[PDB]
Amino acid sequence: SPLPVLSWANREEVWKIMLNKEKTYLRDQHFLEQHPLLQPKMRAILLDWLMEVCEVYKLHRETFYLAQDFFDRYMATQENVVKTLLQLIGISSLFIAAKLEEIYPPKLHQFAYVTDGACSGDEILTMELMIMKALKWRLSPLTIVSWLNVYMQVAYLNDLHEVLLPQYPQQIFIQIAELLDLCVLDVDCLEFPYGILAASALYHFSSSELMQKVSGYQWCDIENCVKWMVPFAMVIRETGSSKLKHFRGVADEDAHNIQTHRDSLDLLDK
Amino acid sequence: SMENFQKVEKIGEGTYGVVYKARNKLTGEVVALKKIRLDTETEGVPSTAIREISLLKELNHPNIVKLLDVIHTENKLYLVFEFLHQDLKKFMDASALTGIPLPLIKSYLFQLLQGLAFCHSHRVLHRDLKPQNLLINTEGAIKLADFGLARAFGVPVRTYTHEVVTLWYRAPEILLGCKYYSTAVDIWSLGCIFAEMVTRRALFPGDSEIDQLFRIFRTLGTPDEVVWPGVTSMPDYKPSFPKWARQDFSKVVPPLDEDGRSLLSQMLHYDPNKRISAKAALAHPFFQDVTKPVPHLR
Numbered sequence A: 001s002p003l004p005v006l007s008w009a010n011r012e013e014v015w016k017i018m019l020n021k022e023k024t025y026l027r028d029q030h031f032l033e034q035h036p037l038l039q040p041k042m043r044a045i046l047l048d049w050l051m052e053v054c055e056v057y058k059l060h061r062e063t064f065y066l067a068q069d070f071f072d073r074y075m076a077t078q079e080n081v082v083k084t085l086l087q088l089i090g091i092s093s094l095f096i097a098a099k100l101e102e103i104y105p106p107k108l109h110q111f112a113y114v115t116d117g118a119c120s121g122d123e124i125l126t127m128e129l130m131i132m133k134a135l136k137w138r139l140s141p142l143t144i145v146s147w148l149n150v151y152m153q154v155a156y157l158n159d160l161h162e163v164l165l166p167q168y169p170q171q172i173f174i175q176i177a178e179l180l181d182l183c184v185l186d187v188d189c190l191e192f193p194y195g196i197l198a199a200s201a202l203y204h205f206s207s208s209e210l211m212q213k214v215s216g217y218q219w220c221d222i223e224n225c226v227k228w229m230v231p232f233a234m235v236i237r238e239t240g241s242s243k244l245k246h247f248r249g250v251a252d253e254d255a256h257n258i259q260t261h262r263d264s265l266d267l268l269d270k
Numbered sequence B: 001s002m003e004n005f006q007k008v009e010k011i012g013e014g015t016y017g018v019v020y021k022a023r024n025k026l027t028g029e030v031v032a033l034k035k036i037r038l039d040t041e042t043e044g045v046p047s048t049a050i051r052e053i054s055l056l057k058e059l060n061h062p063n064i065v066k067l068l069d070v071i072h073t074e075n076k077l078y079l080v081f082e083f084l085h086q087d088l089k090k091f092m093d094a095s096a097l098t099g100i101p102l103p104l105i106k107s108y109l110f111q112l113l114q115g116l117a118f119c120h121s122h123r124v125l126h127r128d129l130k131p132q133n134l135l136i137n138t139e140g141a142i143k144l145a146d147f148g149l150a151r152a153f154g155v156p157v158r159t160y161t162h163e164v165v166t167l168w169y170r171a172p173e174i175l176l177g178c179k180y181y182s183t184a185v186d187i188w189s190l191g192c193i194f195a196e197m198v199t200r201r202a203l204f205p206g207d208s209e210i211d212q213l214f215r216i217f218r219t220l221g222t223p224d225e226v227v228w229p230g231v232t233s234m235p236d237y238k239p240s241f242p243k244w245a246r247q248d249f250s251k252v253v254p255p256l257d258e259d260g261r262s263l264l265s266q267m268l269h270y271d272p273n274k275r276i277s278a279k280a281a282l283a284h285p286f287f288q289d290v291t292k293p294v295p296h297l298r
């Protein structure tokens, strides 16, 4: 229970509803163990491709993580999927995500145009309903980046415990995000709760103490996740942290919330 | 796909789609169907539909409408909900000359404040609390309906859609263009519906964004940096606004007792950070009869 005392509800109640939600939103690291024609590096290239389209369209890190959660969860419902179906499933997961999270999402054509003709608005419109019907309309998960948001807010909180007004450094946020983006590419991250993954990335940038203070989890809870994230953390640390980009038409108080793209696959090879 | 349902009556429109009262041919069970025409939709399933479905499939409380199922008929998407015999707008209208009995107001408000406390704890903003969206039954229950304009919030929140609440029930922070808004916007709406239940007339029936602010300012008094730390700095704030004084709540809501007037006042506080919460409002002396507290641990 890391949230401070809450005005609108019981801080324990709020945090436990948040926790209990990860128990109702199941994700499995062996989903391509259902789709034999599929390889784990295909998921990585698609996930990387969606981050790029997100940056191109100035979409939020939230809508990218909603598409990732939708993709990985939709696959756990499917049996045999061909390499060619992936562009369609990815961009449709992004189409649903954009509509849920954005105020002015890109239009259906903007999502078709970015596939270079390989996907029509009609297939996206059909797939969207297959994904949504197959996910059983469970489209409100607590994404990986959603947790870092919480954690980052709890770090930058004063005696006036204003839990909803955002108050935290943008550069620190980006540098923790980049690591999570890099671990999301490997399908093994799904063995760790989204809350755990976010806490562990925060830990690699802070300490066990800050981590516990902002997330609540004990070091024992995080130990196996920190152990797995160890290579990824070093690939990032070896390269040197990135800088807070500006985006036209995007206010700087929210520039940290815009999804970005790098050589994440070249780094993933390590 | 809707082969077992028989449309009986058209109920209305709402945020999106069309609501029909329908009957389960075999069961005898009466539902409310919200029909969406996908054939017309250029962007497919609207964001308003996708939000209502995913939010309500996670919001099970007795004071929130029950989504029963979602059926797709390869042209149309139907949301099958529990049917409720009347809406609070029709009820207040029918009771305009009579008046709603004060105990029934207190019951309705309490149950409304419970559905909201649940929404807020599950991190959901209703953003469209108006009497036409508050549905009553014959047994004395009231439920929150139409989650088409609702959104799940983050901890911390970020900038959300500005064009968000029905004008008459819109909070001054939305009106004065604050970048962030949260749970306080729904309590404002409930404050308005409360007084409207009491007086049988809209608390602030403005005809524009500016008239809405002025109507609020005339009643609650023009705000300042003491009553609201941040006003004068806010986008749509103009120092040229007429300076009014807060009216006595005895004139504003005469049938309401000292305990009723206190709750309404805290529900209509200008400062979102000071405005009462749904959970806190449950612990107010105005309901100390209808509710008995529970032991607190630690």
Ligand SMILES: CCc1cnn2c(NCc3ccc[n+](O)c3)cc(N3CCCC[C@H]3CCO)nc12
Binding pocket: B011, B012, B013, B014, B015, B019, B021, B032, B065, B081, B082, B083, B084, B085, B086, B087, B090, B132, B133, B134, B135, B145, B146
């Ligand atoms: C969740 C759908 C639902 C269930 N009951 N119900 C009712 N019931 C009252 C009622 C029934 C039959 C005839 N008369 O008219 C009153 C009204 C209503 N709405 C009010 C009108 C605009 C649409 C819509 C908005 C709120 O969901 N929607 C619903």
